[model samples]
Target chain A: FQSMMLDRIRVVLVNTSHPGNIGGAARAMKNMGLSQLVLVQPESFPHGDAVARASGATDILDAARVVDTLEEALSGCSVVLGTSARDRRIPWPLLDPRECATTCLEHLEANGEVALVFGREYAGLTNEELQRCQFHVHIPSDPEFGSLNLAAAVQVLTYEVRMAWLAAQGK
Target chain B: FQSMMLDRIRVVLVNTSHPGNIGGAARAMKNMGLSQLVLVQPESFPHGDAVARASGATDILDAARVVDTLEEALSGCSVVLGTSARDRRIPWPLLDPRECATTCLEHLEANGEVALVFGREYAGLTNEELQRCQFHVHIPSDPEFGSLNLAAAVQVLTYEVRMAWLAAQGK
Candidate 1:
């Protein structure tokens, strides 16, 4: 029953430059049992590097949904979580991964679709894109050098979500 | 005291092939208040990719202590924790990153130097290398696709260490 709710969670990537990160993120998602992958206007898909980096989790890549814009990617999501490492010009409702996971599970239980969105490799989410989401998820990284790799961030968030699901299952 | 203990924790990379991962690991360390880094016979050192990937955390790369062997890297450290993704032929004392950090903090408080060793990219810590460590540190990754990037693995473990330090300080 909980696994069904876990299956309702989706991952959205915006304006990603590196195909390998997409592959890496897909691999990370599969590792945690989350399979929904939506890519918005990525620079390159169906690339060799992505296929190679995905290792054995290419099924996630092969079944990924590609879209033209973020709005299209997050069309049906009731709760949208945008990952950010920097403090933007305006503050949004912020939650860490652990906190976000609980909220994500709550939304999922209500039969509402949820999306965990990530931005580009070099520059993270823009102000306008972040404002679209109800909450921003922060990983509480090192303040001095807090730039985290895109895929690594995905891995952390997905791991938290999986843990939340496991706890709810009384595992 | 937290900063002092963080400083006492050294990260050791053995036979690292790509200089970029070394640099990436340094950035991950700096983001988590860890400073000491030791490289054991890396395939390439002082390479441009490492410095570039460090993303302004070059101080870690600049101050890195390069050694000829794992023995040299672990010298003066009372507690040695090795990071591995695979299970060996024989079971070793293993802990997740969170538990490893708790143990690490205890050792540092006893005025002991600590080393966290990571193996090469293609192959992780060898059998002999695994036996040398008192405890094995494993990141609880997705079982289906558990292949984590080298620097990202470093990032996750160091993040846990920093979090443990914060919790101890009641921050």
Candidate 2:
């Protein structure tokens, strides 16, 4: 079933400082019907703002996986895509979110796990952390003011994956 | 010229109460290479939070047009698109932001002035304001947590418009 592939995807947030975004992220994943959530070394969890902002998707938060490192969070992922807003001096294989979704769905259909990794709110994935990704993804945002909010970015990418899944289901 | 068409596009904010959002909206527009901005009776102007949140995009606020009414702000627009997140009991000619950019760009190339209208922070465009637009735009956000920040929504639409302009330039 197409729904089974959805469960094979993981939404990973690393070093998130704001609890509201953690909650916001959970809500975004749930809105698109994807549930796996992994958090790496968040500043705080079980905070009130997160619950309040989650706006009724707390089950995703309640069932979220909190881990010490990104490695643990992405242990079984065959494909890891890091979301980056900036162009690095060192180039990595970069795909837009659409391409990322297509690739992820293919991997998921093959019974392989996948992870969509997002970095901190202010500073994005560190270069070292980015190096861990099989490839990187850029949202193709405005060149002048490309800094997108962490949760909003999740909403955009998650929406793409959901659309892909729906299309594959012949919806 | 493509730059000329982009300039003809105006971003109108109606009855916005938050100064920080005003500033943040300006930053969003500037980032996406869309410059013209019109404000309809904001609760506060020249506030520090707006400036602080603009993140080096203060020039937009400095040159912003503060108007007495939405009609005054929308004057001379051949086409108007209002961004709405809600599904109104009454349907209007609706387009998602991508379709909006495609239609808007085609109109702009024909030298038609355009406006992309955004309503308040808490409550979006009143029915009266919605009735003025040629069409309405929905961002297709997360359903469970669809409460997108006002400035974040502005960033998404403006980013789409900028991309359309770049593509029109054959790049």
- B88-126 per-residue lDDT for model 2 (tens digits): 654788887768889889889888889999998748999
Best by lDDT: 1
lDDT tens digits by residue: candidate 2, A44-139: 997997896566788988899999999999997899999998887658889876788798889988998889999997589999899999989887
Interface RMSD of each: 1.9, 3.4
- Which parts of model 2 have CA positions greater than 4 angstroms off? A1-8, A17-31, A44-59, A108-112, A169-171, B1-5, B17-24, B41-49, B121-123, B141-147
Off by over 4 Å in 1: A1-6, A108-111
lDDT of 1 at A135: 95
State candidate 2's DockQ. Answer: 0.32
What CAPRI class is candidate 1? medium
Q: Compute the lDDT of residue A74 as modeled in candidate 1.
A: 90
CA displacement after TM-score superposition, residue B99 of candidate 2 (Å)? 0.7
TM-score of each: 0.90, 0.82
